[PDB]
Amino acid sequence: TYDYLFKLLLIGDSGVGKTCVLFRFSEDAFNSTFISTIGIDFKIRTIELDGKRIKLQIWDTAGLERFREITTAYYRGAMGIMLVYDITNEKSFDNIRNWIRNIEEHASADVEKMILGNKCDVNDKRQVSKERGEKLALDYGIKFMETSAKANINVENAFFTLARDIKAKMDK
Numbered sequence: 001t002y003d004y005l006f007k008l009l010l011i012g013d014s015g016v017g018k019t020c021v022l023f024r025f026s027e028d029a030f031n032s033t034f035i036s037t038i039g040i041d042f043k044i045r046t047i048e049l050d051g052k053r054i055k056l057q058i059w060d061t062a063g064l065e066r067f068r069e070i071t072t073a074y075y076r077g078a079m080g081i082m083l084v085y086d087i088t089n090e091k092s093f094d095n096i097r098n099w100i101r102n103i104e105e106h107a108s109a110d111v112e113k114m115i116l117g118n119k120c121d122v123n124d125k126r127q128v129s130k131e132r133g134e135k136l137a138l139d140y141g142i143k144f145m146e147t148s149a150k151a152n153i154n155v156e157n158a159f160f161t162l163a164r165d166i167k168a169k170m171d172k
């Protein structure tokens with residue numbers, strides 16, 4: 001079985017790497033061919049924290065605008081949300097502010113939030129400095145990490161940290 005079940009959501013503009021982050025976390029693999037998510041998808045992985053078994057039910061939203069009705073319906077049950085942008089795409093970083101408004105208008109007001117700056121293996125095409133990502137997350141009081149699904153950087157750490165913070169809030 002499991003001791004806790006945490007429903008998690010990945011949100012962010014299309015193309016930032018939500019599906020590849022989840023594929024790395026659930027299957028420890030990376031595919032370079034862009035296959036945009038249609039509607040929604042999910043993966044399930046159970047981790048251990050403090051000797052407790054935490055089942056992570058992770059919903060991978062479709063970032064394309066025409067799927068917003070489906071994304072919105074998945075906000076209510078969520079306990080933690082990854083807000084993903086692409087360090088090579090300034091617009092996806094700008095839009096983190098709008099994804100935050102979306103979360104706070106629909107999700108439970110207590111939902112745990114974390115910002116991921118993905119594709120940090122592509123330093124040659126970086127547009128969003130790490131300093132600016134840290135500052136935005138500081139402005140919102142949110143944790144922040146740069147990740148790479150391709151090189152498997154901070155993917156484990158992002159999900160384990162988010163789960164730990166959800167568990168800490170529950171255990172208090």
Ligand SMILES: Nc1nc2c(ncn2[C@@H]2O[C@H](COP(=O)(O)OP(=O)(O)OP(=O)(O)O)[C@@H](O)[C@H]2O)c(=O)[nH]1
Nearest residue numbers: 014015016017018019020032034036037063149150
């Ligand atoms: N170099 C590099 N490329 C990445 C990384 N993560 C994702 N990509 C590439 O970025 C493209 C988009 O990745 P996806 O995971 O499909 O993006 P998404 O956010 O799920 O997009 P939608 O499903 O349309 O919302 C794909 O071609 C990936 O291979 C990464 O960490 N590093």
Ligand SMILES: [Mg+2]
Nearest residue numbers: 018019036037
């Ligand atoms: Mg996807």
